[PDB]
Amino acid sequence: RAKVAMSHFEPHEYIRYDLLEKNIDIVRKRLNRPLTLSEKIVYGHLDDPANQEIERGKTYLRLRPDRVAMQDATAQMAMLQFISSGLPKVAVPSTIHCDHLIEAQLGGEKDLRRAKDINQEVYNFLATAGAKYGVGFWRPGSGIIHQIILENYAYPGVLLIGTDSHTPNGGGLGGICIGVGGADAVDVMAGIPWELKCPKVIGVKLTGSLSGWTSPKDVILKVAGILTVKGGTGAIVEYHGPGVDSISCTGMATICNMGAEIGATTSVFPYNHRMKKYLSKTGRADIANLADEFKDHLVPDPGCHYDQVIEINLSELKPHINGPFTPDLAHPVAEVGSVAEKEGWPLDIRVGLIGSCTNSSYEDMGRSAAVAKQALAHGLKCKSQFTITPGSEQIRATIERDGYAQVLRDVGGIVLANACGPCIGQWDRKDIKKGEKNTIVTSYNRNFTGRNDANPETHAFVTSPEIVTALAIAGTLKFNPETDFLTGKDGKKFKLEAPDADELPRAEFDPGQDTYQHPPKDSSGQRVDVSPTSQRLQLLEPFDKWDGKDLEDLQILIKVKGKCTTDHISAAGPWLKFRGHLDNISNNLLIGAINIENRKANSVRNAVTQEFGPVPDTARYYKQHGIRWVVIGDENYGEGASREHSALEPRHLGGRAIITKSFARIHETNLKKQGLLPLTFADPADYNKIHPVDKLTIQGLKDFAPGKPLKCIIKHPNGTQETILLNHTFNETQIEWFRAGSALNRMKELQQK
Ligand code: SF4
């Protein structure tokens, strides 16, 4: 048909809208009903469209994704697992992005230089693994992974998977972009089918047009407060309505991005003119042109059934600000100054932070700049500390050139390197002592306890870049930009005008410096050296196969109460240093969870010694002595980041099973991949029958089966037994992973030995 290539860097890899079409057609013949946009792209990508059983919320689809993307903090373990497979070359276009390890301290060029020195060992291992398996590499300084994908790799109709939970960002350009763990991405780099449980679809209908201070971030801050952190679990969010055309392509990216915060498999928009415009301005005008010929399969079918519909009138929507320690606690900016005051949240703002993959684009930077020049016109500068992260080299080079970066500098801001930085806690914050209670306002997405500075008493509120700017100028949460009056230098009271700004540069985008490094697809005659005495990298040893027996007299390591995020299970910040060393990173296991016995973080009873101590050391002690253990958690366990370390670490320290009232998706998949047993209570009130002193026997593992529950004998210390039933979402493919000890031990048996 046409030969239009997937990117400027793979000129030989072509977009298959013909294959999409062929399979959407086979599927709609079988179903005879309207398909939504997400069903078309997803079902369009099935390995077997004539035979696949499709039932939303029930069947597991075996899919063929178009590309794989990884960032430096999760690419390490994903590549160390690819090296154990023993396969020579990745089978689909794959990329590594070096965005997570650049700590913020001094600002821009300085922080990058110091990071290239400190992280040389790791960046070197990724560059060599890259050259060898044929994975493209974006060097430190290039930008935050999702801004680089939308600028170079995302198009209408792509199915892209990535080792980072905010990969949905790509829905701003009409693809199905989905967050996964390192072992899922190894399957796809290895060329085997990827499985996804078939999603429900929540249609959200946008009406009106946004006006003034309201921006794209307010739509997803309000959707989050309406649907809550677990309302999107098992669903794709599918936007539609007349209001869509009012939103920029990067603002659509913004909204798809933070759908991660309601547990959604991903979010997506239909191909329209704002997207076409952006493809053309990022040199992919031929992809805009080919999407016009395929437009019917890149929009939803007339009258498709959504499993839930929600409607938002953009024109009625006001400025929002969410948190303190969950992103679905939504307030209007006009009332946050009084709830905080009622609730005891601190009112003076210490630091205001714009950036992250949710809000770091050319439009975000210019809208922020426009509040800042008004303050400058009255001789005012930031009363809070103000830091600014650009999303990529191209945005850094271009806002510099269009004058924005200098306006933001003149009000008192520091421009950091194009990296995550403060958002995964790679910040060297020294204005507060730890445990000092304070307020930081960000334009980020998560605001879980201790995540930006490892201080639990930091109250972080997430919002939009123009509201962060306005409030940093004011220095207080009691300030509504829309109503209130600042006082200039001159003695005159003035009020801020709502910001106006271009969505893309009028001129072309200045590209900045070279940051991409292509694989030699020639040479690749590299050796990947991992020093055997290294502290940051260590090769893997397989896990144990299942011994054919049931799990008797298991010890409860911890029974967790409340919210247990993957930032509570495996902390980030200073622990990023060890993302390539399983034994050294296993020392943060569960140190942030609250134990129900004492309401304390990292303080659990050792069953043997009866002394209370750290969770890592207690699990190593149990392991050392042959005690197999279990974790009992509450609802929506594993909320957050997709880091597979949160499942690798309990397996490394002797953990056998995890039993919760519900799981967040990616974490449940990550636990089955590593040989553990994620199990749910068939009755959630059974959580109250189990006490940390009891021993549990999981029985009937020998005739393990999809749909059939397993029985748990809660042995109470007094001799009382009790049976409860525990359900599991395993299909027979997954049961082969557990029997073998892990998906990777299974993939290695199938290589005929
Ligand atoms: S949420 Fe923060 S840490 Fe995660 S990719 Fe976005 S910017 Fe980096």
Swiss-Prot record:
The modification N6-succinyllysine is found at residues 3, 22, 110, 116, 205, 383, 489, 495, 521, 545, 549, 563, 577, 600, 661, 695, 702. Its EC number is 4.2.1.3. GO terms for molecular function: 4 iron, 4 sulfur cluster binding; aconitate hydratase activity; metal ion binding. Binds 1 [4Fe-4S] cluster per subunit. Binding of a [3Fe-4S] cluster leads to an inactive enzyme. GO terms for biological process: tricarboxylic acid cycle. Residues 523-533 have a biased composition (Polar residues). Forms covalent cross-links mediated by transglutaminase TGM2, between a glutamine and the epsilon-amino group of a lysine residue, forming homopolymers and heteropolymers. Substrate binds at residues 71, 164-166, 446, 451, 579, 642-643. It is found in: Mitochondrion. PROSITE patterns: ACONITASE_1, ACONITASE_2. InterPro entries: Acnase/IPM_dHydase_lsu_aba_1/3, Acoase/IPM_deHydtase_lsu_aba, Aconitase/3IPM_dehydase_swvl, Aconitase/IPM_isomerase, Aconitase_4Fe-4S_BS, Aconitase_4Fe-4S_dom, Aconitase_dom2, Aconitase_mito-like. Residues 496-533 are annotated as: Disordered. It catalyses: citrate = D-threo-isocitrate. Pfam families: Aconitase (PF00330), Aconitase_C (PF00694). SUPFAM superfamilies: Aconitase iron-sulfur domain, LeuD/IlvD-like. Residues 496-509 have a biased composition (Basic and acidic residues). It comes from the Eukaryota. CDD domains: AcnA_Mitochon_Swivel (cd01578), AcnA_Mitochondrial (cd01584). Keywords: 4Fe-4S, Acetylation, Iron, Iron-sulfur, Lyase, Metal-binding, Mitochondrion, Phosphoprotein, Pyrrolidone carboxylic acid, Transit peptide, Tricarboxylic acid cycle. One of its GO terms (cellular component) is cytosol. Catalyzes the isomerization of citrate to isocitrate via cis-aconitate. Belongs to the aconitase/IPM isomerase family. Monomer. This is Aconitate hydratase, mitochondrial. It comes from Sus scrofa. The lineage of its organism: Eukaryota, Metazoa, Chordata, Craniata, Vertebrata.
